[PDB]
Amino acid sequence: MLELKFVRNNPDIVGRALISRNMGTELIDSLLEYDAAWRECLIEGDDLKHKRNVVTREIAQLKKENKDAASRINEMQGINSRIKELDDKIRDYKSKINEIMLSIPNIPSETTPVGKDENDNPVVRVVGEPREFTFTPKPHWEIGESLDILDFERAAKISGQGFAVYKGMGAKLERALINFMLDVHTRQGYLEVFPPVLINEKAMTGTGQLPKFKDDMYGCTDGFYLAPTAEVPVTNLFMDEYMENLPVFLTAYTACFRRETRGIIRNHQFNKVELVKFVMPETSYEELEKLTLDAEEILKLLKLPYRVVSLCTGDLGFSAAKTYDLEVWVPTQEKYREISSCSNFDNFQARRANIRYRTPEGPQFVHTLNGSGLAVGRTVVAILENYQREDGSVVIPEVLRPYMGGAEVIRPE
Ligand SMILES: Nc1ncnc2c1ncn2[C@@H]1O[C@H](COS(=O)(=O)NC(=O)[C@@H](N)CO)[C@@H](O)[C@H]1O
Ligand SMILES: [Cl-]
Ligand SMILES: [K+]
């Protein structure tokens, strides 16, 4: 969430932010009405609480001077009743202000381009040259079923639609990618952590998934949610702390769960290796450029042609101030497809989760950043498509061979 005082003082900064996201400004209008009622009730109640303290002492003084106190004791019943009414209103208004503040998206950065949707996302850079095929490439689901390394029919029987079972060299490729990704990020300076994927409500609120995106998440017995991304458990590790040794760079593998495209492009469960940073505010714009480079290094090392796109205001996520997407080439679609989002959140998540650090002039919120390095299933799609042979077998990218016993090609078994 934003800072309430800042929204009060700059309603047309915030309102134009919400129009740039294709929203109206009704939430700001509502917020400022409830805020004004809170402020006026606090003034009236603080005055009456002071008066009740004085009248209590006046009654004591009248009793010591042997004077009748009945008119004062009468006034006190009215004071006490009006105070109770004002406190009940203040309780209601604060609850309404908190609900509204948790629903207002982050302010887009000054370098986020203005646009309405994904058609207005500028291309930042194009890296690598897409393969020129001499035969007609097959999509990843046809290659995976023919090699018997992806099983959709048996996944549907145990789970349902939108799942996959990896088998044999498919399972070994996914495992090799995760190991490779975590090893490279370790060399880049990230600390490997492995957290749970059952998340409480406070953590899911902290990164912005709740309350707005509750219906997109799996909820579980005992009040838990399944993580939609390692962003949720990892970022919230430092909830209600003062952080040390900034910047802090973490990386994690987790399974990811989303209620929600063919094959493994869009599934209810998928694997992802995430990058998370906690940094001092003046450094976060450069930390985003550096995190993006750390994520795209995986694509460069795997020799998978890609491009980097800048998300416009209309396509930006709720909690993000600035995002770059990595988009990998998909031969059968003759287009690039999202494989990562890399974002700066400014202090939006840090305010929600109370993640601060000490400065000589007092405490400040950290900035948080994250990015996919990478979604593993979509990397398997990009390998099966871009490394396929005319015979339907798939060449194993050179960097993964040491993680696969020196295997060079996935063939039918
Ligand atoms: N349902 C899904 N199935 C498979 N892959 C997915 C699905 N949803 C997202 N992805 C992949 O996961 C990446 C990260 O998801 S994200 O929502 O864009 N961003 C995040 O979750 C951030 N925490 C950065 O990882 C995507 O860019 C996409 O490549
Ligand atoms: Cl306007
Ligand atoms: K939007």
From Swiss-Prot:
GO terms for molecular function: ATP binding; serine-tRNA ligase activity. It is found in: Cytoplasm. GO terms for biological process: selenocysteine biosynthetic process; seryl-tRNA aminoacylation. ATP binds at residues 258-260, 338-341. It catalyses: tRNA(Ser) + L-serine + ATP = L-seryl-tRNA(Ser) + AMP + diphosphate + H(+); tRNA(Sec) + L-serine + ATP = L-seryl-tRNA(Sec) + AMP + diphosphate + H(+). Pfam families: Seryl_tRNA_N, tRNA-synt_2b. One of its GO terms (cellular component) is cytoplasm. Its EC number is 6.1.1.11. Keywords: Aminoacyl-tRNA synthetase, ATP-binding, Cytoplasm, Ligase, Nucleotide-binding, Protein biosynthesis. L-serine binds at residues 229-231, 274, 372. Pathway: Aminoacyl-tRNA biosynthesis; selenocysteinyl-tRNA(Sec) biosynthesis; L-seryl-tRNA(Sec) from L-serine and tRNA(Sec): step 1/1. The keyword Ligase applies. It is an enzyme of class 6 (ligase). The keyword Cytoplasm applies. SUPFAM superfamilies: Class II aaRS and biotin synthetases, tRNA-binding arm. InterPro entries: aa-tRNA-synt_IIb (IPR002314), aa-tRNA-synth_II (IPR006195), aa-tRNA-synth_II/BPL/LPL (IPR045864), Ser-tRNA-ligase_type_1 (IPR002317), Ser-tRNA-synth_1_N (IPR015866), SerRS_1_N_sf (IPR042103), SerRS_core (IPR033729), tRNA-bd_arm (IPR010978). Its main location: cytoplasm. Belongs to the class-II aminoacyl-tRNA synthetase family. Type-1 seryl-tRNA synthetase subfamily. Consists of two distinct domains, a catalytic core and a N-terminal extension that is involved in tRNA binding. Catalyzes the attachment of serine to tRNA(Ser). Is also able to aminoacylate tRNA(Sec) with serine, to form the misacylated tRNA L-seryl-tRNA(Sec), which will be further converted into selenocysteinyl-tRNA(Sec). Homodimer. The tRNA molecule binds across the dimer. This is Serine--tRNA ligase. It comes from Methanosarcina mazei (strain ATCC BAA-159 / DSM 3647 / Goe1 / Go1 / JCM 11833 / OCM 88).
